[PDB]
mmCIF file of C-alpha atoms in Angstrom:
data_model
loop_
_atom_site.group_PDB
_atom_site.id
_atom_site.type_symbol
_atom_site.label_atom_id
_atom_site.label_comp_id
_atom_site.label_asym_id
_atom_site.label_seq_id
_atom_site.Cartn_x
_atom_site.Cartn_y
_atom_site.Cartn_z
ATOM 1 C CA UNK A 1 75.005 73.561 125.337
ATOM 2 C CA UNK A 2 78.790 73.699 125.189
ATOM 3 C CA UNK A 3 78.330 74.838 121.599
ATOM 4 C CA UNK A 4 79.927 78.240 122.038
ATOM 5 C CA UNK A 5 82.413 76.584 124.382
ATOM 6 C CA UNK A 6 83.290 74.010 121.732
ATOM 7 C CA UNK A 7 83.892 76.812 119.259
ATOM 8 C CA UNK A 8 86.054 78.775 121.686
ATOM 9 C CA UNK A 9 88.152 75.773 122.670
ATOM 10 C CA UNK A 10 88.539 74.540 119.097
ATOM 11 C CA UNK A 11 89.309 78.035 117.814
ATOM 12 C CA UNK A 12 92.061 78.302 120.425
ATOM 13 C CA UNK A 13 93.663 74.959 119.474
ATOM 14 C CA UNK A 14 93.559 75.860 115.801
ATOM 15 C CA UNK A 15 95.276 79.174 116.630
ATOM 16 C CA UNK A 16 98.146 77.749 118.703
ATOM 17 C CA UNK A 17 99.002 74.156 117.817
ATOM 18 C CA UNK A 18 96.533 72.680 115.303
ATOM 19 C CA UNK A 19 98.854 69.973 113.941
ATOM 20 C CA UNK A 20 100.549 69.163 117.254
ATOM 21 C CA UNK A 21 97.265 68.786 119.121
ATOM 22 C CA UNK A 22 95.382 67.144 116.236
ATOM 23 C CA UNK A 23 94.088 64.360 118.496
ATOM 24 C CA UNK A 24 92.442 66.913 120.794
ATOM 25 C CA UNK A 25 91.036 68.799 117.801
ATOM 26 C CA UNK A 26 89.501 65.561 116.563
ATOM 27 C CA UNK A 27 88.096 64.574 119.966
ATOM 28 C CA UNK A 28 86.351 67.931 120.153
ATOM 29 C CA UNK A 29 85.010 67.616 116.606
ATOM 30 C CA UNK A 30 83.645 64.072 116.886
ATOM 31 C CA UNK A 31 82.081 65.018 120.225
ATOM 32 C CA UNK A 32 80.336 68.067 118.813
ATOM 33 C CA UNK A 33 79.797 67.067 115.190
ATOM 34 C CA UNK A 34 77.986 63.733 114.738
ATOM 35 C CA UNK A 35 77.153 64.843 111.199
ATOM 36 C CA UNK A 36 79.109 66.628 108.489
ATOM 37 C CA UNK A 37 76.533 69.429 108.658
ATOM 38 C CA UNK A 38 77.489 69.909 112.315
ATOM 39 C CA UNK A 39 81.168 69.871 111.339
ATOM 40 C CA UNK A 40 80.475 72.522 108.684
ATOM 41 C CA UNK A 41 78.600 74.702 111.163
ATOM 42 C CA UNK A 42 81.503 74.295 113.620
ATOM 43 C CA UNK A 43 84.041 75.064 110.890
ATOM 44 C CA UNK A 44 82.363 78.277 109.792
ATOM 45 C CA UNK A 45 82.047 79.490 113.379
ATOM 46 C CA UNK A 46 85.766 78.848 113.894
ATOM 47 C CA UNK A 47 86.642 80.390 110.530
ATOM 48 C CA UNK A 48 84.953 83.590 111.666
ATOM 49 C CA UNK A 49 87.272 83.704 114.676
ATOM 50 C CA UNK A 50 90.487 82.829 112.841
ATOM 51 C CA UNK A 51 89.608 85.403 110.165
ATOM 52 C CA UNK A 52 89.060 88.022 112.850
ATOM 53 C CA UNK A 53 92.298 86.974 114.576
ATOM 54 C CA UNK A 54 94.178 87.298 111.279
ATOM 55 C CA UNK A 55 92.585 90.682 110.643
ATOM 56 C CA UNK A 56 93.738 91.883 114.057
ATOM 57 C CA UNK A 57 97.220 90.410 113.495
ATOM 58 C CA UNK A 58 96.868 88.010 116.423
ATOM 59 C CA UNK A 59 97.858 85.162 114.060
ATOM 60 C CA UNK A 60 99.656 84.791 110.741
ATOM 61 C CA UNK A 61 98.691 83.538 107.290
ATOM 62 C CA UNK A 62 100.880 80.476 108.017
ATOM 63 C CA UNK A 63 98.915 79.764 111.211
ATOM 64 C CA UNK A 64 95.616 79.940 109.298
ATOM 65 C CA UNK A 65 97.124 77.629 106.681
ATOM 66 C CA UNK A 66 98.191 75.090 109.347
ATOM 67 C CA UNK A 67 94.719 75.201 110.940
ATOM 68 C CA UNK A 68 93.089 74.674 107.566
ATOM 69 C CA UNK A 69 95.162 71.537 106.852
ATOM 70 C CA UNK A 70 94.520 70.261 110.365
ATOM 71 C CA UNK A 71 90.773 70.596 109.797
ATOM 72 C CA UNK A 72 91.033 68.637 106.538
ATOM 73 C CA UNK A 73 92.818 65.742 108.278
ATOM 74 C CA UNK A 74 90.311 65.870 111.135
ATOM 75 C CA UNK A 75 87.367 65.736 108.732
ATOM 76 C CA UNK A 76 88.561 62.693 106.759
ATOM 77 C CA UNK A 77 89.375 60.976 110.071
ATOM 78 C CA UNK A 78 85.803 61.544 111.279
ATOM 79 C CA UNK A 79 83.567 61.733 108.203
ATOM 80 C CA UNK A 80 83.902 59.643 105.006
ATOM 81 C CA UNK A 81 80.657 58.385 103.447
ATOM 82 C CA UNK A 82 80.689 56.307 100.237
ATOM 83 C CA UNK A 83 78.310 57.104 97.367
ATOM 84 C CA UNK A 84 74.678 56.104 98.030
ATOM 85 C CA UNK A 85 73.697 52.761 96.489
ATOM 86 C CA UNK A 86 70.711 54.271 94.670
ATOM 87 C CA UNK A 87 70.975 58.054 94.472
ATOM 88 C CA UNK A 88 68.336 60.768 94.217
ATOM 89 C CA UNK A 89 70.609 62.433 91.669
ATOM 90 C CA UNK A 90 74.135 63.245 90.510
ATOM 91 C CA UNK A 91 75.868 66.311 91.939
ATOM 92 C CA UNK A 92 79.232 67.752 90.926
ATOM 93 C CA UNK A 93 80.983 69.876 93.582
ATOM 94 C CA UNK A 94 83.609 72.201 92.160
ATOM 95 C CA UNK A 95 85.959 74.990 93.193
ATOM 96 C CA UNK A 96 86.688 78.191 91.265
ATOM 97 C CA UNK A 97 89.876 77.741 89.161
ATOM 98 C CA UNK A 98 92.890 79.227 90.917
ATOM 99 C CA UNK A 99 91.252 78.553 94.296
ATOM 100 C CA UNK A 100 91.216 75.543 96.596
ATOM 101 C CA UNK A 101 88.099 75.158 98.782
ATOM 102 C CA UNK A 102 89.337 71.714 99.818
ATOM 103 C CA UNK A 103 87.527 71.438 103.144
ATOM 104 C CA UNK A 104 84.376 73.185 101.960
ATOM 105 C CA UNK A 105 84.020 71.012 98.860
ATOM 106 C CA UNK A 106 84.569 67.846 100.916
ATOM 107 C CA UNK A 107 82.131 69.087 103.565
ATOM 108 C CA UNK A 108 79.619 69.780 100.786
ATOM 109 C CA UNK A 109 79.992 66.258 99.385
ATOM 110 C CA UNK A 110 79.539 64.685 102.826
ATOM 111 C CA UNK A 111 76.283 66.557 103.413
ATOM 112 C CA UNK A 112 74.781 65.621 100.063
ATOM 113 C CA UNK A 113 75.848 61.972 100.289
ATOM 114 C CA UNK A 114 74.262 61.939 103.739
ATOM 115 C CA UNK A 115 70.832 62.426 102.138
ATOM 116 C CA UNK A 116 71.188 60.367 98.991
ATOM 117 C CA UNK A 117 73.065 62.283 96.303
ATOM 118 C CA UNK A 118 75.827 60.633 94.316
ATOM 119 C CA UNK A 119 78.548 63.284 94.619
ATOM 120 C CA UNK A 120 81.911 63.918 93.005
ATOM 121 C CA UNK A 121 84.472 66.594 93.995
ATOM 122 C CA UNK A 122 86.482 68.445 91.326
ATOM 123 C CA UNK A 123 89.159 71.137 91.536
ATOM 124 C CA UNK A 124 89.311 72.353 87.937
ATOM 125 C CA UNK A 125 92.300 74.044 86.330
ATOM 126 C CA UNK A 126 89.989 76.210 84.221
ATOM 127 C CA UNK A 127 86.434 76.898 83.010
ATOM 128 C CA UNK A 128 87.094 74.903 79.839
ATOM 129 C CA UNK A 129 88.336 71.911 81.854
ATOM 130 C CA UNK A 130 85.269 72.063 84.084
ATOM 131 C CA UNK A 131 82.876 72.320 81.105
ATOM 132 C CA UNK A 132 84.502 69.261 79.531
ATOM 133 C CA UNK A 133 83.892 67.386 82.781
ATOM 134 C CA UNK A 134 80.258 68.497 82.953
ATOM 135 C CA UNK A 135 79.407 67.196 79.472
ATOM 136 C CA UNK A 136 81.339 63.953 79.844
ATOM 137 C CA UNK A 137 79.619 63.183 83.159
ATOM 138 C CA UNK A 138 76.292 64.603 81.958
ATOM 139 C CA UNK A 139 75.761 66.139 85.412
ATOM 140 C CA UNK A 140 72.711 68.345 85.952
ATOM 141 C CA UNK A 141 73.713 70.133 89.134
ATOM 142 C CA UNK A 142 76.930 71.990 89.947
ATOM 143 C CA UNK A 143 77.694 73.304 93.431
ATOM 144 C CA UNK A 144 80.404 75.958 93.498
ATOM 145 C CA UNK A 145 82.158 75.446 96.823
ATOM 146 C CA UNK A 146 83.142 78.753 98.464
ATOM 147 C CA UNK A 147 86.552 79.260 100.098
ATOM 148 C CA UNK A 148 85.608 80.442 103.581
ATOM 149 C CA UNK A 149 88.952 80.651 105.411
ATOM 150 C CA UNK A 150 91.873 81.279 103.044
ATOM 151 C CA UNK A 151 92.308 82.009 99.333
ATOM 152 C CA UNK A 152 88.799 83.487 99.343
ATOM 153 C CA UNK A 153 86.974 84.364 96.124
ATOM 154 C CA UNK A 154 86.328 88.022 95.467
ATOM 155 C CA UNK A 155 82.636 88.365 94.614
ATOM 156 C CA UNK A 156 83.372 89.545 91.074
ATOM 157 C CA UNK A 157 85.565 86.483 90.527
ATOM 158 C CA UNK A 158 82.876 83.906 91.343
ATOM 159 C CA UNK A 159 80.416 85.906 89.244
ATOM 160 C CA UNK A 160 82.761 85.897 86.244
ATOM 161 C CA UNK A 161 83.347 82.167 86.660
ATOM 162 C CA UNK A 162 79.612 81.467 86.803
ATOM 163 C CA UNK A 163 79.039 83.739 83.801
ATOM 164 C CA UNK A 164 81.768 82.019 81.762
ATOM 165 C CA UNK A 165 80.208 78.641 82.414
ATOM 166 C CA UNK A 166 76.833 79.945 81.286
ATOM 167 C CA UNK A 167 78.350 81.772 78.313
ATOM 168 C CA UNK A 168 79.067 78.434 76.673
ATOM 169 C CA UNK A 169 76.500 76.641 74.499
ATOM 170 C CA UNK A 170 77.392 73.106 75.598
ATOM 171 C CA UNK A 171 75.538 73.299 78.934
ATOM 172 C CA UNK A 172 71.751 72.688 78.761
ATOM 173 C CA UNK A 173 69.497 73.168 81.808
ATOM 174 C CA UNK A 174 72.354 72.977 84.299
ATOM 175 C CA UNK A 175 71.645 73.838 87.932
ATOM 176 C CA UNK A 176 74.318 76.112 89.436
ATOM 177 C CA UNK A 177 74.440 76.718 93.190
ATOM 178 C CA UNK A 178 76.787 79.303 94.751
ATOM 179 C CA UNK A 179 77.849 79.929 98.341
ATOM 180 C CA UNK A 180 79.815 82.309 100.529
ATOM 181 C CA UNK A 181 79.457 86.034 99.864
ATOM 182 C CA UNK A 182 77.457 85.584 96.610
ATOM 183 C CA UNK A 183 74.588 84.060 98.579
ATOM 184 C CA UNK A 184 74.108 87.423 100.302
ATOM 185 C CA UNK A 185 72.968 88.919 97.000
ATOM 186 C CA UNK A 186 69.263 89.492 96.255
ATOM 187 C CA UNK A 187 67.508 86.601 94.456
ATOM 188 C CA UNK A 188 67.007 88.896 91.461
ATOM 189 C CA UNK A 189 70.657 89.881 91.099
ATOM 190 C CA UNK A 190 71.554 86.228 91.577
ATOM 191 C CA UNK A 191 69.618 84.719 88.658
ATOM 192 C CA UNK A 192 71.068 87.615 86.679
ATOM 193 C CA UNK A 193 74.508 86.198 87.475
ATOM 194 C CA UNK A 194 73.640 82.730 86.219
ATOM 195 C CA UNK A 195 73.265 80.993 89.575
ATOM 196 C CA UNK A 196 69.958 79.204 90.213
ATOM 197 C CA UNK A 197 70.285 79.324 93.999
ATOM 198 C CA UNK A 198 72.599 80.598 96.711
ATOM 199 C CA UNK A 199 73.406 78.893 100.010
ATOM 200 C CA UNK A 200 74.389 81.412 102.711
ATOM 201 C CA UNK A 201 76.107 78.755 104.808
ATOM 202 C CA UNK A 202 77.468 75.302 103.995
ATOM 203 C CA UNK A 203 74.857 73.460 106.050
ATOM 204 C CA UNK A 204 72.094 75.228 104.113
ATOM 205 C CA UNK A 205 73.246 73.519 100.910
ATOM 206 C CA UNK A 206 71.047 70.381 101.055
ATOM 207 C CA UNK A 207 67.848 72.419 101.525
ATOM 208 C CA UNK A 208 68.904 74.699 98.659
ATOM 209 C CA UNK A 209 69.752 71.733 96.456
ATOM 210 C CA UNK A 210 66.303 70.172 96.891
ATOM 211 C CA UNK A 211 64.530 73.401 95.878
ATOM 212 C CA UNK A 212 66.211 73.517 92.469
ATOM 213 C CA UNK A 213 66.918 69.915 91.399
ATOM 214 C CA UNK B 1 107.583 44.786 91.108
ATOM 215 C CA UNK B 2 104.209 45.341 92.745
ATOM 216 C CA UNK B 3 105.429 48.507 94.448
ATOM 217 C CA UNK B 4 106.513 49.756 91.024
ATOM 218 C CA UNK B 5 102.997 49.597 89.558
ATOM 219 C CA UNK B 6 101.477 50.981 92.767
ATOM 220 C CA UNK B 7 103.829 53.977 92.656
ATOM 221 C CA UNK B 8 102.844 54.618 89.020
ATOM 222 C CA UNK B 9 99.116 54.295 89.707
ATOM 223 C CA UNK B 10 99.257 56.481 92.835
ATOM 224 C CA UNK B 11 101.357 59.126 91.012
ATOM 225 C CA UNK B 12 98.840 59.227 88.189
ATOM 226 C CA UNK B 13 95.896 59.546 90.619
ATOM 227 C CA UNK B 14 97.718 62.361 92.442
ATOM 228 C CA UNK B 15 98.543 64.079 89.155
ATOM 229 C CA UNK B 16 94.963 64.152 87.904
ATOM 230 C CA UNK B 17 92.202 64.155 90.496
ATOM 231 C CA UNK B 18 93.555 63.273 93.953
ATOM 232 C CA UNK B 19 90.700 65.075 95.764
ATOM 233 C CA UNK B 20 87.888 63.722 93.571
ATOM 234 C CA UNK B 21 89.199 60.158 93.778
ATOM 235 C CA UNK B 22 90.246 60.212 97.425
ATOM 236 C CA UNK B 23 88.639 56.843 98.154
ATOM 237 C CA UNK B 24 90.762 55.083 95.500
ATOM 238 C CA UNK B 25 93.881 56.787 96.836
ATOM 239 C CA UNK B 26 93.071 55.473 100.327
ATOM 240 C CA UNK B 27 92.249 52.010 99.023
ATOM 241 C CA UNK B 28 95.533 51.877 97.092
ATOM 242 C CA UNK B 29 97.398 53.020 100.208
ATOM 243 C CA UNK B 30 95.693 50.466 102.485
ATOM 244 C CA UNK B 31 96.646 47.642 100.134
ATOM 245 C CA UNK B 32 100.245 48.722 99.452
ATOM 246 C CA UNK B 33 101.169 50.695 102.551
ATOM 247 C CA UNK B 34 99.910 48.805 105.615
ATOM 248 C CA UNK B 35 102.463 50.469 107.912
ATOM 249 C CA UNK B 36 103.288 54.165 108.206
ATOM 250 C CA UNK B 37 106.827 53.334 107.119
ATOM 251 C CA UNK B 38 105.406 51.801 103.941
ATOM 252 C CA UNK B 39 103.262 54.913 103.463
ATOM 253 C CA UNK B 40 106.428 57.051 103.799
ATOM 254 C CA UNK B 41 108.349 54.952 101.294
ATOM 255 C CA UNK B 42 105.414 55.147 98.888
ATOM 256 C CA UNK B 43 105.006 58.924 99.339
ATOM 257 C CA UNK B 44 108.738 59.405 98.851
ATOM 258 C CA UNK B 45 108.738 57.563 95.508
ATOM 259 C CA UNK B 46 105.703 59.534 94.302
ATOM 260 C CA UNK B 47 107.206 62.860 95.444
ATOM 261 C CA UNK B 48 110.204 62.136 93.248
ATOM 262 C CA UNK B 49 107.916 61.554 90.252
ATOM 263 C CA UNK B 50 105.847 64.669 90.997
ATOM 264 C CA UNK B 51 108.977 66.791 91.413
ATOM 265 C CA UNK B 52 110.307 65.634 88.037
ATOM 266 C CA UNK B 53 106.952 66.263 86.340
ATOM 267 C CA UNK B 54 106.706 69.720 87.915
ATOM 268 C CA UNK B 55 110.223 70.594 86.746
ATOM 269 C CA UNK B 56 109.190 69.448 83.253
ATOM 270 C CA UNK B 57 106.015 71.569 83.303
ATOM 271 C CA UNK B 58 103.925 68.433 82.933
ATOM 272 C CA UNK B 59 101.965 69.444 86.025
ATOM 273 C CA UNK B 60 101.299 72.671 87.878
ATOM 274 C CA UNK B 61 102.305 73.662 91.392
ATOM 275 C CA UNK B 62 98.563 73.819 92.104
ATOM 276 C CA UNK B 63 98.247 70.139 91.149
ATOM 277 C CA UNK B 64 101.083 69.226 93.500
ATOM 278 C CA UNK B 65 99.450 71.206 96.331
ATOM 279 C CA UNK B 66 96.153 69.287 95.840
ATOM 280 C CA UNK B 67 97.994 65.956 95.739
ATOM 281 C CA UNK B 68 99.800 66.838 98.981
ATOM 282 C CA UNK B 69 96.525 67.745 100.712
ATOM 283 C CA UNK B 70 94.843 64.535 99.578
ATOM 284 C CA UNK B 71 97.765 62.552 101.005
ATOM 285 C CA UNK B 72 97.324 64.343 104.333
ATOM 286 C CA UNK B 73 93.653 63.334 104.511
ATOM 287 C CA UNK B 74 94.350 59.736 103.422
ATOM 288 C CA UNK B 75 97.137 59.441 105.979
ATOM 289 C CA UNK B 76 94.956 60.598 108.845
ATOM 290 C CA UNK B 77 92.174 58.247 107.702
ATOM 291 C CA UNK B 78 94.474 55.230 107.679
ATOM 292 C CA UNK B 79 97.210 55.843 110.297
ATOM 293 C CA UNK B 80 96.456 57.621 113.583
ATOM 294 C CA UNK B 81 98.186 55.789 116.456
ATOM 295 C CA UNK B 82 97.739 57.096 120.000
ATOM 296 C CA UNK B 83 100.869 58.402 121.698
ATOM 297 C CA UNK B 84 102.460 55.624 123.815
ATOM 298 C CA UNK B 85 101.611 56.410 127.449
ATOM 299 C CA UNK B 86 104.630 54.408 128.546
ATOM 300 C CA UNK B 87 107.289 55.184 125.973
ATOM 301 C CA UNK B 88 110.864 54.194 125.221
ATOM 302 C CA UNK B 89 111.617 57.911 124.913
ATOM 303 C CA UNK B 90 110.465 61.447 124.049
ATOM 304 C CA UNK B 91 111.015 62.764 120.533
ATOM 305 C CA UNK B 92 110.133 66.144 119.112
ATOM 306 C CA UNK B 93 109.358 66.218 115.402
ATOM 307 C CA UNK B 94 109.529 69.755 114.083
ATOM 308 C CA UNK B 95 109.044 71.607 110.826
ATOM 309 C CA UNK B 96 111.379 74.400 109.716
ATOM 310 C CA UNK B 97 109.827 77.888 109.963
ATOM 311 C CA UNK B 98 108.778 79.189 106.570
ATOM 312 C CA UNK B 99 108.073 75.608 105.507
ATOM 313 C CA UNK B 100 105.258 73.169 106.170
ATOM 314 C CA UNK B 101 106.247 69.525 106.036
ATOM 315 C CA UNK B 102 102.822 68.637 107.398
ATOM 316 C CA UNK B 103 102.746 65.175 105.825
ATOM 317 C CA UNK B 104 106.400 64.336 106.525
ATOM 318 C CA UNK B 105 106.154 65.432 110.184
ATOM 319 C CA UNK B 106 102.971 63.383 110.627
ATOM 320 C CA UNK B 107 104.675 60.399 108.941
ATOM 321 C CA UNK B 108 107.659 60.716 111.269
ATOM 322 C CA UNK B 109 105.417 60.737 114.341
ATOM 323 C CA UNK B 110 103.473 57.670 113.088
ATOM 324 C CA UNK B 111 106.633 55.688 112.418
ATOM 325 C CA UNK B 112 108.111 56.532 115.813
ATOM 326 C CA UNK B 113 104.883 55.871 117.718
ATOM 327 C CA UNK B 114 104.701 52.507 115.946
ATOM 328 C CA UNK B 115 108.010 51.488 117.567
ATOM 329 C CA UNK B 116 107.143 52.854 120.980
ATOM 330 C CA UNK B 117 108.486 56.428 121.074
ATOM 331 C CA UNK B 118 106.341 59.133 122.634
ATOM 332 C CA UNK B 119 106.404 61.822 119.976
ATOM 333 C CA UNK B 120 105.074 65.300 119.502
ATOM 334 C CA UNK B 121 104.841 67.333 116.311
ATOM 335 C CA UNK B 122 105.508 71.085 116.278
ATOM 336 C CA UNK B 123 105.521 73.644 113.479
ATOM 337 C CA UNK B 124 107.394 76.445 115.298
ATOM 338 C CA UNK B 125 107.406 80.099 114.292
ATOM 339 C CA UNK B 126 111.100 80.566 114.984
ATOM 340 C CA UNK B 127 114.261 79.286 116.617
ATOM 341 C CA UNK B 128 113.292 80.951 119.910
ATOM 342 C CA UNK B 129 109.865 79.280 119.947
ATOM 343 C CA UNK B 130 111.300 75.800 119.366
ATOM 344 C CA UNK B 131 114.055 76.430 121.913
ATOM 345 C CA UNK B 132 111.533 77.386 124.611
ATOM 346 C CA UNK B 133 109.506 74.308 123.653
ATOM 347 C CA UNK B 134 112.616 72.127 123.840
ATOM 348 C CA UNK B 135 113.204 73.451 127.367
ATOM 349 C CA UNK B 136 109.772 73.136 128.958
ATOM 350 C CA UNK B 137 109.394 69.555 127.764
ATOM 351 C CA UNK B 138 113.019 68.520 128.376
ATOM 352 C CA UNK B 139 113.353 66.944 124.951
ATOM 353 C CA UNK B 140 116.409 64.773 124.296
ATOM 354 C CA UNK B 141 115.838 64.136 120.582
ATOM 355 C CA UNK B 142 114.711 66.495 117.808
ATOM 356 C CA UNK B 143 113.760 65.297 114.344
ATOM 357 C CA UNK B 144 113.627 67.986 111.673
ATOM 358 C CA UNK B 145 111.075 66.896 109.088
ATOM 359 C CA UNK B 146 112.009 67.549 105.439
ATOM 360 C CA UNK B 147 109.601 68.870 102.800
ATOM 361 C CA UNK B 148 109.932 66.333 99.992
ATOM 362 C CA UNK B 149 107.699 68.413 97.695
ATOM 363 C CA UNK B 150 109.463 71.740 98.224
ATOM 364 C CA UNK B 151 112.472 72.963 96.251
ATOM 365 C CA UNK B 152 116.190 72.987 97.081
ATOM 366 C CA UNK B 153 115.993 76.321 98.964
ATOM 367 C CA UNK B 154 114.856 74.437 102.081
ATOM 368 C CA UNK B 155 118.364 73.020 102.430
ATOM 369 C CA UNK B 156 119.905 76.358 103.234
ATOM 370 C CA UNK B 157 116.961 77.231 105.492
ATOM 371 C CA UNK B 158 117.380 73.984 107.403
ATOM 372 C CA UNK B 159 121.166 74.321 107.818
ATOM 373 C CA UNK B 160 120.606 77.831 109.085
ATOM 374 C CA UNK B 161 117.828 76.751 111.439
ATOM 375 C CA UNK B 162 119.765 73.868 112.955
ATOM 376 C CA UNK B 163 122.942 75.948 113.236
ATOM 377 C CA UNK B 164 121.164 78.746 115.055
ATOM 378 C CA UNK B 165 119.464 76.143 117.226
ATOM 379 C CA UNK B 166 122.743 74.402 118.220
ATOM 380 C CA UNK B 167 124.334 77.804 118.793
ATOM 381 C CA UNK B 168 121.974 78.350 121.738
ATOM 382 C CA UNK B 169 123.134 77.978 125.319
ATOM 383 C CA UNK B 170 119.938 76.603 126.892
ATOM 384 C CA UNK B 171 119.444 73.150 125.304
ATOM 385 C CA UNK B 172 121.729 70.533 126.899
ATOM 386 C CA UNK B 173 121.742 66.829 125.900
ATOM 387 C CA UNK B 174 120.174 67.286 122.482
ATOM 388 C CA UNK B 175 120.453 64.915 119.496
ATOM 389 C CA UNK B 176 119.433 66.370 116.162
ATOM 390 C CA UNK B 177 118.429 64.392 113.087
ATOM 391 C CA UNK B 178 117.802 65.864 109.650
ATOM 392 C CA UNK B 179 116.455 64.276 106.465
ATOM 393 C CA UNK B 180 115.921 64.916 102.761
ATOM 394 C CA UNK B 181 118.887 65.904 100.609
ATOM 395 C CA UNK B 182 120.824 67.116 103.646
ATOM 396 C CA UNK B 183 121.271 63.543 104.842
ATOM 397 C CA UNK B 184 123.350 63.070 101.695
ATOM 398 C CA UNK B 185 125.951 65.456 103.151
ATOM 399 C CA UNK B 186 129.337 64.115 104.313
ATOM 400 C CA UNK B 187 129.325 63.491 108.114
ATOM 401 C CA UNK B 188 131.607 66.450 108.923
ATOM 402 C CA UNK B 189 129.447 68.862 106.939
ATOM 403 C CA UNK B 190 126.389 67.523 108.723
ATOM 404 C CA UNK B 191 127.985 67.902 112.160
ATOM 405 C CA UNK B 192 129.206 71.396 111.285
ATOM 406 C CA UNK B 193 125.576 72.519 110.896
ATOM 407 C CA UNK B 194 124.679 71.362 114.404
ATOM 408 C CA UNK B 195 122.996 68.150 113.327
ATOM 409 C CA UNK B 196 124.107 64.786 114.656
ATOM 410 C CA UNK B 197 122.927 62.321 112.018
ATOM 411 C CA UNK B 198 120.767 62.058 108.930
ATOM 412 C CA UNK B 199 118.006 59.843 107.632
ATOM 413 C CA UNK B 200 118.442 59.545 103.874
ATOM 414 C CA UNK B 201 114.819 58.481 103.394
ATOM 415 C CA UNK B 202 111.738 58.918 105.558
ATOM 416 C CA UNK B 203 111.330 55.187 106.144
ATOM 417 C CA UNK B 204 114.807 54.977 107.692
ATOM 418 C CA UNK B 205 114.011 57.385 110.524
ATOM 419 C CA UNK B 206 113.267 54.702 113.198
ATOM 420 C CA UNK B 207 116.716 53.098 112.710
ATOM 421 C CA UNK B 208 118.443 56.511 112.582
ATOM 422 C CA UNK B 209 116.828 57.452 115.877
ATOM 423 C CA UNK B 210 117.903 54.191 117.528
ATOM 424 C CA UNK B 211 121.552 55.008 116.790
ATOM 425 C CA UNK B 212 121.498 58.354 118.669
ATOM 426 C CA UNK B 213 119.093 57.005 121.317
#
């Protein structure tokens, strides 16, 4: 299928010269990712390899950082849908304060716009700043975008963030969806945390979003 | 002037929600920065504003990081010229190790490609890595890209980088251009570091390069 091959080749470019060979990175991505869901699947496969390479000291934090930025520029180059004319609903896609899931959040938005959600991305300074946004925009669904390559969220940190949001009394019937490592928790222990649904991988977000909203 | 208001509006967008309002950022940039040189001049004016605001604790370093990333994505959406197959010359645009002028290096490449130079971007790990690169590709002109949104410490790092680079015995024929605050140095101080000429502002790089061929 040249799926594993795409991953290998792209992983290699990202590890050696992501910003110098950006054009080749993009060619590979637009050839193997017609949709943002395909991009996301490709990204997570590559992130597994870079993460392993970092763990084995075959690359540096700086190299992962350069690859991450390269991927962001590649994504906007390839995928950039406007809001749907008439949406199926309003979704807010947000990172955990102190973290910056830039690619993941933008990948999330592109998937949900692709099937008719009016989406907005937010990188909030704090819980209080996010809550203020929620009310003001009267949004009913919040997707917490996981950081999957660098500046990852410790499980207890996303949980605390979700809890803090719930702890407030100015959020009625809000749908919270969480990703990354939290989505590996049992359904029981998840609703206990305040999340209504987990999505184990980015591409699984649209299916998860339909089941709850 | 028009550019005045555009700088103010872009700076405000970047200071508040650059990643959530990425479309507006792009739209502003398409209307006010139709060439990469215009983009550079616009980024440079905003960087000054963001630097001041950061120094005054009116914004966080996190905010600046998000602004910078949004500008990377916008830039790749709008300007992405192919490398001239028949070029007027071969220029290497490099970042300084320990720094990541991702946007400035990309801007430099766009501006040079726009006037017919074959250009490559590299973010090298070290002096040795760039040196080897300079050899294998027989580069005759090196442009060191400044980080307009990093602090004054980069000056020393750049002087040291360029000095160590010039000190090497395996790079004949090489012109070196530096930018940012270093291009405000007196000519003799500039030459002493190993550099040959400066570009005081990003937009002036094409003309600076012409002078040293």
